[PDB]
Design a protein around this ligand. Structure first.
Ligand SMILES: Nc1nc(=O)c2ncn([C@@H]3O[C@@H]4COP(=O)(O)O[C@H]5[C@@H](O)[C@H](n6cnc7c(N)ncnc76)O[C@@H]5COP(=O)(O)O[C@@H]3[C@@H]4O)c2[nH]1
Ligand SMILES: [Zn+2]
Length: 339
């Protein structure tokens, strides 16, 4: 039961030196990119947001951009995607073009990756939709660099009922977090940006307990992070197996992370994450995730009425597929976690 799950966690640790040198190799490139971008007029004020690492060999950095005051107009009744208006060059009328601002980004990075031949890097474009300009360092370490407009404005109205952390983290912490900037990434679904809160996701994962002193001492070790690790790992391991038909590629660790936050709201006390109960805690996350699949419904933690599992994004076939795989997995004490 747990023993099997502790074994997986111990295994996972064995590659703790592998990801640290691979990410140090990401760092050197990102530092290099920040310099060359602060030499351009458009991007002069860029910085790094802080918040990295998704799957093994897959990294994510965010390049924040301080911008004057933003006014948003919600695109359609899609609660996450917006237009932007008061960098002049990128105007299409009064609207700041995501597509245009994402092209001058991708441009600068392509030119300035050929030189510094020191490291062997290739610029890539991965997928449509995506706001990430995706590099591949020495054909093994791929990094997602995502540009991010910063708005020190009050969050948009579609986030009014999101971040329901009051019963787990304090109502006062939700106020602290919603006084913080939010971010727009040029993901279009069109010249449209969509909301991001990856910096808030980093804080509620690292400052995750009802007790302010969760995980700071031997009396208060919860298994929240471990559970999210096992969930992330369950998805990767399954995405490997069923790559004989590449039928699970729409699912990602964000889904696992999103669903885990939802479980943390349902189970707000550290006592529900006692590390002795790792097995039952892990069950909790897997049963909720299933429910999300089978009900075709998984709310963005910050944008409730944005359904990461609607038909728009993932079709019914792929979700029924993963429901069957995860259901079999749970019913049999997870043979994917064997040997
Ligand atoms: N590195 C990175 N940061 C991003 O913000 C992001 N947003 C999209 N993508 C990639 O673009 C493509 C389109 O996915 P879609 O947006 O339609 O659903 C996405 C998206 O709605 C959600 N999601 C992923 N990252 C974030 C994020 N930071 N904030 C909010 N939602 C996110 O989870 C779904 C699957 O994402 P990924 O399959 O892991 O990579 C996606 C995908 O390749 C991103 N990649
Ligand atoms: Zn803890």
């Amino acid at each position: 039961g747990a023993s099997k799950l502790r074994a997986v966690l111990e295994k996972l640790k064995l590659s703790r030196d592998d990801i640290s040198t691979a990410a140090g190799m990401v760092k050197g490139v990102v530092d290099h990119l920040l310099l060359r971008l602060k030499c351009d007029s458009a991007f002069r004020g860029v910085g790094l947001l802080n918040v990295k690492i998704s799957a093994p060999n897959e990294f994510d950095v965010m390049f924040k951009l301080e911008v004057p005051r933003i006014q948003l107009e919600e695109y359609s009744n899609t609660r996450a995607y917006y237009f932007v208006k008061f960098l002049s060059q990128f105007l299409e009328g009064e609207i700041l073009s995501a597509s245009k601002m994402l092209s001058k980004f991708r441009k600068i990075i392509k030119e300035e990756i050929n030189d510094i031949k020191d490291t062997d890097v290739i610029m890539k474009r991965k997928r449509g939709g995506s706001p990430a300009v995706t590099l591949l360092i020495s054909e093994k370490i791929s990094v997602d660099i995502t540009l991010a407009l910063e708005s020190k404005s009050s969050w948009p109205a579609s986030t009014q009922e999101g971040l329901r952390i009051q019963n787990w983290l304090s109502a006062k912490v939700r106020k602290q977090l919603r006084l913080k900037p939010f971010y727009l990434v040029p993901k279009h679904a069109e010249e449209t940006w969509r909301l991001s809160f990856s910096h808030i996701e980093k804080e509620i994962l690292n400052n995750h307990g009802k007790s302010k002193t969760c995980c700071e001492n031997k009396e208060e070790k919860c298994c929240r992070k471990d559970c999210l690790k096992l969930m992330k790992y369950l998805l990767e391991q399954l995405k490997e197996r069923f790559k004989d038909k590449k039928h699970l590629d729409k699912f990602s660790s964000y889904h696992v992370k999103t669903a885990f936050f939802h479980v943390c709201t349902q189970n707000p006390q550290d006592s529900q994450w006692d590390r002795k109960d790792l097995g039952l805690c892990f069950d909790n996350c897997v049963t909720y995730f299933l429910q999300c699949l089978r009900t075709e419904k998984l709310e963005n933690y910050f944008i409730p009425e944005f359904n990461l599992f609607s038909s728009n994004l993932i079709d019914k076939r792929s979700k029924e597929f993963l429901t069957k795989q995860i259901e079999y997995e749970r019913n049999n004490e997870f043979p994917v976690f064997d040997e």
